[PDB]
Amino acid sequence: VWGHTQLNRLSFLETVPVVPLRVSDESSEDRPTWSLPDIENVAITHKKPNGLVDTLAYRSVRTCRWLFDTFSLYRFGSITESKVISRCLFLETVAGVPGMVGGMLRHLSSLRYMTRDKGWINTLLVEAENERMHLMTFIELRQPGLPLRVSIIITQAIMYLFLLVAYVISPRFVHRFVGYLEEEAVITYTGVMRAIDEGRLRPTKNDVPEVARVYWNLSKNATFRDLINVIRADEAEHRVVNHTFADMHEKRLQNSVNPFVVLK
Amino acid sequence: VWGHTQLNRLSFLETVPVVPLRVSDESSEDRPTWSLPDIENVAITHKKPNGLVDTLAYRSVRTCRWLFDTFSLYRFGSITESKVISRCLFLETVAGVPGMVGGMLRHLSSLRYMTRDKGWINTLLVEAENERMHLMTFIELRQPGLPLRVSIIITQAIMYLFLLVAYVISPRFVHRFVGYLEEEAVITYTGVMRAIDEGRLRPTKNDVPEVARVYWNLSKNATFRDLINVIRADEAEHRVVNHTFADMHEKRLQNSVNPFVVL
């Protein structure tokens, strides 16, 4: 029921105070679809940096981890729900940035050179959305203080700008920087799940929020452990995909077709 | 198949040579789905300015029209198929910016304020994608010279700048601005149909490009007129959407649900 009569209306303002808020609208219809026994066997992997830019990309992520794990006491003391969710609530505010600068910029280019993009943009945006559904999820399990919020705001100002210019200078540097961040994120989310398997972390949030149960399509009886498992598997897809784009840059392939649009 | 053994692979660089260049993968799977008999009756509306910000929007769009229509010599002489494609080519580059910058700025806003967007982001990113498809479609009908290629590149620089600062400063203003640009879009586009029906324009490009076919799900028999039909339907949507989104801002409803997700 979207046709010429609706296309000729000036505005549908007047219909806002009667539309349901619905958790399944918060994203596109392009949802991850995982099966837990399968993605159960996601694994920690490392790709060798293959020259200066890769090495410089890796040294950066590795530098930031050591830095980030230390100014946020993440090794000091036992693992906890509070510290884990707090970590991921923050780190996901940054994860949602690179895909939107990457998607924007290729869009921006495509229009000003009138070229095809051959599938890249789309992958890049729904990654960025996916990463933000990780946050929409986490922000429901824990609300943060003025400190952590302010500190989040100041971060985006920094990571947005850096990724903006990094992507203009060298897309290859950015796609390898995210690829390596995802290695670190499949290590974190594996450490969280391991801990659950080994009793060291007894999750309490085992009510998976509504945003999350529809987005990944989890059963009503899904545990916090199941939520980490699927989040984890999105980070691995990101891992393979950005590394593949990084690689494609390296080999003069930024204007060949996005291999993942078929491989879907 | 998409599972762990793929997610556990390090790169799919070896595959790129064998993955074909299908034209459906140029856009997302969120395609428009019009009915030519229906969208044939899409018409020309005009949202009334409220105050300063709406007027500003409106005087911006009219002065920019008057400028562009005289610098490009659109109104000088008889309409031709060429000066039609040429004009859309140019203007469709601009068209793709606003939705992507809103989308981006609202994405960033949901990221940092950890708030729920409620469906705005992906409507503006499809808007963005959709205009970009307009462009891709005309790039089949006319591959332009360097003078236009230059004009388009500087014209992005400025516009990106203008729409970025403006959208941070007053997203209401931007969405209105858009409404009016899309009003004009439809005037121009119904004119081109009028002028086809009256045989003052002979659509010599009736081999409607493959891209557009799979995008707008048109049959092989579809013509230029039918192509312009769906395209101008698209603009009529962006016309409403953007006047609604600005209305919502005017009322302080920026953080309320995107009506159009639940139509």
Ligand SMILES: CC(C)=CCC/C(C)=C/CC/C(C)=C/Cc1c(O)c2ccccc2oc1=O
């Ligand atoms: C505040 C500022 C100026 C810059 C922020 C620095 C920054 C990007 C730090 C993160 C780099 C890092 C240690 C990554 C590790 C990591 C993740 O990125 C991550 C992302 C999502 C989910 C779980 C994650 O777990 C991690 O250990």
Ligand SMILES: CC(C)=CCC/C(C)=C/CC/C(C)=C/Cc1c(O)c2ccccc2oc1=O
């Ligand atoms: C070069 C520069 C700094 C700014 C460009 C100014 C500018 C955007 C002018 C366009 C205003 C205008 C004439 C609107 C009419 C119009 C469209 O917007 C339009 C959009 C999509 C498809 C067809 C269109 O046809 C139009 O006539």
Ligand SMILES: [Fe+3]
């Ligand atoms: Fe994440």
Ligand SMILES: [Fe+3]
């Ligand atoms: Fe990530």
Ligand SMILES: [Fe+3]
């Ligand atoms: Fe358009």
Ligand SMILES: [Fe+3]
């Ligand atoms: Fe338009």
Ligand SMILES: [O-]
């Ligand atoms: O992430």
